[PDB]
Write an enzyme that holds these catalytic residues in place. Structure first.
Site, PDB file in Angstrom:
ATOM      1  N   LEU A  53       0.825  -1.201   0.000  1.00  0.00           N
ATOM      2  CA  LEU A  53       0.000   0.000   0.000  1.00  0.00           C
ATOM      3  C   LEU A  53       0.863   1.256   0.000  1.00  0.00           C
ATOM      4  O   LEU A  53       1.881   1.324   0.686  1.00  0.00           O
ATOM      5  CB  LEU A  53      -0.910   0.007   1.227  1.00  0.00           C
ATOM      6  CG  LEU A  53      -1.779  -1.236   1.437  1.00  0.00           C
ATOM      7  CD1 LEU A  53      -2.577  -1.083   2.728  1.00  0.00           C
ATOM      8  CD2 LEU A  53      -2.709  -1.429   0.250  1.00  0.00           C
ATOM      9  N   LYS A  63       7.517  -2.509  11.607  1.00  0.00           N
ATOM     10  CA  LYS A  63       6.748  -2.293  12.820  1.00  0.00           C
ATOM     11  C   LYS A  63       5.501  -3.157  12.830  1.00  0.00           C
ATOM     12  O   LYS A  63       5.160  -3.752  13.849  1.00  0.00           O
ATOM     13  CB  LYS A  63       6.387  -0.812  12.954  1.00  0.00           C
ATOM     14  CG  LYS A  63       7.598   0.044  13.285  1.00  0.00           C
ATOM     15  CD  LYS A  63       7.242   1.497  13.506  1.00  0.00           C
ATOM     16  CE  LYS A  63       8.412   2.257  14.122  1.00  0.00           C
ATOM     17  NZ  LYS A  63       9.649   2.143  13.298  1.00  0.00           N
ATOM     18  N   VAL A  94      -4.682  19.782  25.563  1.00  0.00           N
ATOM     19  CA  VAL A  94      -5.414  20.997  25.923  1.00  0.00           C
ATOM     20  C   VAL A  94      -5.429  21.896  24.689  1.00  0.00           C
ATOM     21  O   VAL A  94      -4.368  22.226  24.158  1.00  0.00           O
ATOM     22  CB  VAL A  94      -4.697  21.781  27.047  1.00  0.00           C
ATOM     23  CG1 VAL A  94      -5.469  23.044  27.364  1.00  0.00           C
ATOM     24  CG2 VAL A  94      -4.542  20.920  28.272  1.00  0.00           C
ATOM     25  N   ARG A 140     -17.349  12.939  22.602  1.00  0.00           N
ATOM     26  CA  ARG A 140     -17.850  12.945  21.225  1.00  0.00           C
ATOM     27  C   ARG A 140     -19.248  13.552  21.245  1.00  0.00           C
ATOM     28  O   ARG A 140     -19.853  13.684  22.312  1.00  0.00           O
ATOM     29  CB  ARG A 140     -17.959  11.518  20.697  1.00  0.00           C
ATOM     30  CG  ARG A 140     -16.709  10.679  20.837  1.00  0.00           C
ATOM     31  CD  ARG A 140     -15.799  10.895  19.673  1.00  0.00           C
ATOM     32  NE  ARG A 140     -16.511  10.744  18.410  1.00  0.00           N
ATOM     33  CZ  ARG A 140     -16.054  11.214  17.258  1.00  0.00           C
ATOM     34  NH1 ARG A 140     -14.891  11.852  17.230  1.00  0.00           N
ATOM     35  NH2 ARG A 140     -16.761  11.077  16.146  1.00  0.00           N
ATOM     36  N   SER A 171     -17.278  16.144   9.816  1.00  0.00           N
ATOM     37  CA  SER A 171     -17.755  14.765   9.746  1.00  0.00           C
ATOM     38  C   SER A 171     -19.277  14.688   9.690  1.00  0.00           C
ATOM     39  O   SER A 171     -19.830  13.701   9.222  1.00  0.00           O
ATOM     40  CB  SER A 171     -17.240  13.954  10.944  1.00  0.00           C
ATOM     41  OG  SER A 171     -17.841  14.371  12.157  1.00  0.00           O
ATOM     42  N   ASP A 181     -16.756  17.889  17.060  1.00  0.00           N
ATOM     43  CA  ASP A 181     -17.118  19.298  17.203  1.00  0.00           C
ATOM     44  C   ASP A 181     -18.094  19.686  16.091  1.00  0.00           C
ATOM     45  O   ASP A 181     -18.505  18.836  15.296  1.00  0.00           O
ATOM     46  CB  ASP A 181     -15.868  20.186  17.109  1.00  0.00           C
ATOM     47  CG  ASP A 181     -15.307  20.284  15.686  1.00  0.00           C
ATOM     48  OD1 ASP A 181     -15.829  19.619  14.767  1.00  0.00           O
ATOM     49  OD2 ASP A 181     -14.328  21.033  15.477  1.00  0.00           O
ATOM     50  N   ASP A 247     -16.667  25.987  15.311  1.00  0.00           N
ATOM     51  CA  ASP A 247     -15.923  26.849  14.411  1.00  0.00           C
ATOM     52  C   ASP A 247     -16.913  27.366  13.371  1.00  0.00           C
ATOM     53  O   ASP A 247     -17.759  26.617  12.879  1.00  0.00           O
ATOM     54  CB  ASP A 247     -14.809  26.083  13.685  1.00  0.00           C
ATOM     55  CG  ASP A 247     -13.730  25.565  14.623  1.00  0.00           C
ATOM     56  OD1 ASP A 247     -13.409  26.241  15.616  1.00  0.00           O
ATOM     57  OD2 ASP A 247     -13.187  24.478  14.347  1.00  0.00           O
TER      58      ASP A 247
END
Ligand SMILES: C[C@@](F)(P(=O)(O)O)P(=O)(O)OP(=O)(O)OC[C@H]1O[C@@H](n2cnc3c(=O)[nH]c(N)nc32)C[C@@H]1O
Ligand SMILES: [Cl-]
Ligand SMILES: [Cl-]
Ligand SMILES: [Cl-]
Ligand SMILES: [Mg+2]
Ligand code: NA
Ligand code: NA
Ligand code: NA
Length: 326
Positions: A53, A63, A94, A140, A171, A181, A247
């Site tokens: 890929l 890994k 934060v 969420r 989303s 958000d 936002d």
DNA sequence: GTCGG
DNA sequence: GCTGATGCGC
DNA sequence: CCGACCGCGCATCAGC
């Protein structure tokens, strides 16, 4: 989640490079690998299979082999045990505190939530609000709540000026059952790439949302971009909802399609699409798609009448928002 | 860290 | 005050 | 190899 173990490992590595190593390109390399693998319709059996890929090279293939064989990664195991790395990673959680601020705070001996709280004096405005809602911002948002939030935002904007058009992107527009958000794209006919016929277009909306107690805090605010906090109203005797990040981006009405394409994302989808654009001789931002001259300098904005036009310019078949979650 | 020229 | 670089989040 | 890695608004700071 078919290869959730591997994707989580890669994401942890990405965050490490970004937050601790301050190696942004390594961060993106890991995110891309994670993204391509999350998309893979097969349960990965080996690193070799994964290396096939794009984005998965020799290092990541090794890994994956280690992870598949033992169920963990020694490199990460050591990182988790490192107090400094762990502290820096934590603080960056934060909002407002990035890799630089996190490392600095750690140097000053500020390494925990308790420390941050007793040192609010050393935080800028954004960081202070991020700390205030640290827990809430981790939660969420069920799509059901996003619908209620959308309902409030559109109706309040309508009350300000019927000509405003607010579109929830992120989303949510991609059809997710939950979101981190709320992202709101805003347009008004008085504001185009040609002229700004009315001032405080964004301000009026922000003001109205604070008026009805929807917007509770402000992280940053400019003429075209608002970044803050909001909260759904609760009923009598019921526990109030968690505060949420919101936002709002005011974009020239005539550049809506480039704007909604940008704000719908995902972020990795945008990076992949913008990179493909360059290869095809175009450059894309939230405002326009311009061709690249013989030298490589952006030319004049190309005509756009739909999101599909943007895809057509770079020779990509159209992809519905729901298929852009990379 | 991974890729294409 | 401004311009420009940097951090940060997108 | 070796350069390239998306593109940008707002906050903050240095330097003038
Ligand atoms: C992570 C989410 F799924 P949720 O918030 O629901 O958990 P989503 O809403 O998708 O992202 P978020 O709210 O951070 O940013 C909103 C959009 O901004 C664009 N965007 C964000 N980051 C970038 C970036 O680095 N580059 C570009 N070009 N666009 C970006 C594309 C993003 O979709
Ligand atoms: Cl890097
Ligand atoms: Cl457009
Ligand atoms: Cl532009
Ligand atoms: Mg979002
Ligand atoms: Na590969
Ligand atoms: Na942060
Ligand atoms: Na957002």
């Amino acid at each position: 989640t078919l290869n959730g173990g591997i994707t989580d490992m890669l994401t942890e590595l990405a965050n490490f490079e970004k937050n601790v190593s301050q190696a942004i390109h390594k961060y993106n390399a890991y995110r891309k690998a994670a993204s391509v693998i999350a998309k893979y319709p097969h349960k990965i059996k080996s690193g070799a299979e994964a290396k096939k890929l794009p984005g998965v090279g020799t290092k990541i293939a090794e890994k994956i082999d280690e992870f598949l064989a033992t169920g963990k990664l020694r490199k990460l195991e050591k990182i988790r045990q490192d107090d400094t790395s762990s502290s820096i990673n934590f603080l960056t959680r934060v909002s407002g505190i990035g890799p630089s601020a996190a490392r600095k705070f750690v140097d000053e001996g500020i390494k925990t939530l308790e420390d941050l709280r007793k040192n609010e004096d050393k935080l800028n405005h954004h960081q202070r609000i991020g700390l205030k809602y640290f827990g809430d911002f981790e939660k969420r948002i069920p799509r059901e709540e996003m619908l209620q939030m959308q309902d409030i935002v559109l109706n309040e904007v309508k009350k300000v000026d019927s000509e405003y058009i607010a579109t929830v992107c992120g989303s949510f527009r991609r059809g997710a059952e939950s979101s981190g958000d709320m992202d709101v794209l805003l347009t008004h006919p008085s504001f185009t790439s040609e002229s700004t016929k009315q001032p405080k277009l964004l301000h009026q909306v922000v003001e109205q949302l604070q008026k009805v107690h929807f917007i509770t805090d402000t992280l940053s605010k400019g003429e075209t971009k608002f970044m803050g906090v909001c909260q759904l109203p609760s009923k009598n005797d019921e526990k109030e909802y968690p505060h949420r990040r919101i936002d709002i981006r005011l974009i020239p009405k005539d550049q809506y399609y480039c704007g909604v394409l940008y704000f719908t994302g995902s972020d990795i989808f945008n990076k992949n699409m913008r990179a493909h654009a360059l290869e095809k001789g175009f450059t894309i931002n939230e405002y326009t798609i311009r061709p690249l001259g013989v030298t490589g300098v952006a030319g004049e904005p190309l005509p756009v009448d739909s999101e599909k036009d943007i895809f057509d310019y770079i020779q990509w078949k159209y992809r519905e928002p729901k298929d852009r979650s990379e």
